Amino acid sequence: TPPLKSGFVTLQVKNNTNGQYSNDQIYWAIVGKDPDTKQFVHVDLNGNLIPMKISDNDAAGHLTKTTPDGTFNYSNYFCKASQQSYAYIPKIIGARMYISYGKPLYIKVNQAADGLIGYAGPNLANTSDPNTGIMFEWAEMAWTNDGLWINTTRVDQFCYPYNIQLVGNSGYNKTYGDTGTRADLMNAYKNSVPAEFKSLVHSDRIYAPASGLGTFTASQANAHYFDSYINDVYSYYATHELTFTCDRGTYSGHVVGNDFVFNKNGGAYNLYIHGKPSTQEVLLGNGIFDGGNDDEKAIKAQVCAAFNRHVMLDPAHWNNSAYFYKDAPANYFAKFWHDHSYENKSYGFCYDDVFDFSSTLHVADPKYAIINVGW
């Protein structure tokens, strides 16, 4: 059991790199938002939520990096595992625990357009990003009035294998994440996926399809990978009903013009997906899959996930993974991580938590988590 503090959850980093890196070569930082002020914060070594300030980029002990675009200073919220191998968190929202190997990440504190002080994490779509080539992952978490959620994520990348064990105060004990070594997973990926997905592999990480240097963005070779399937599905549901049931109730939809219109529990059809999705919107879960009331949000989540899983024409089996990824186009990147994880639980794309297939761990009364970082 990691060290505990009354009123906190402990996140313990465990070094499973089998000698590739020492604890003196592992760096962690937690960034997120204060639940009350919504200010962006970093967590200090005692669990305090310290507000980010633009001046942190230049303060004592800051980082500096020369990229092809210039020389810059960055904040330094990171801590070596050898200094302290665990973190305390209080209630917190939208949090990420970045864990990097060899050197800390370069995080630039800024101001977002909406007026508030924020930070820029790695943007690996930019080859001049200061973090290019660095071995890192992050855990995502939030601890609210309703309990704690924590997860690994392959939504943007696979860099190194990691998994999380979440332990509750009163019985909950689960472990979700990658299985296998980095070398074996890299090699297996290349041999497994269809041709369109193979070059997502780089020496440092595998990019998700439309993330970073991924080839499924609008400007790349596979920009239209899902288009024909999307077309078939919208054409089909112009004259057939898409009917599905989840916890929220039973929804039924049909395509009217370019909209996908649903009702709820047999009511009027007034719940909209506005438009027909692009390949990027399927892969990323954004665009027309963003916004709306709570019903529209849940509907958009299900439809996006069903596109990625290639089951839009089989709503009865949206909850049954035996039917997922059975024909192209599908998110074969996502499917790979499911095929290489505990209980096939993985965040392989944004909405993978539809019908609980994601790596999300959750409990009302969290005690601690172990973050197992490997190689």
Automatic annotation (TrEMBL):
UniProt keyword annotation of Transport present? no
Give yes or no: UniProt keyword Metal-binding. yes
Q: Keywords, A to Z? A: Calcium, Metal-binding, Repeat, Signal
> The GH64 domain covers which part of the protein?
6-375
Molecular function per GO? carbohydrate binding; metal ion binding
Family, per the entry?
Belongs to the beta/gamma-crystallin family.
Recorded protein name is Beta and gamma crystallin
- What fragment of the full-length protein is this? 215 to 589 of 589
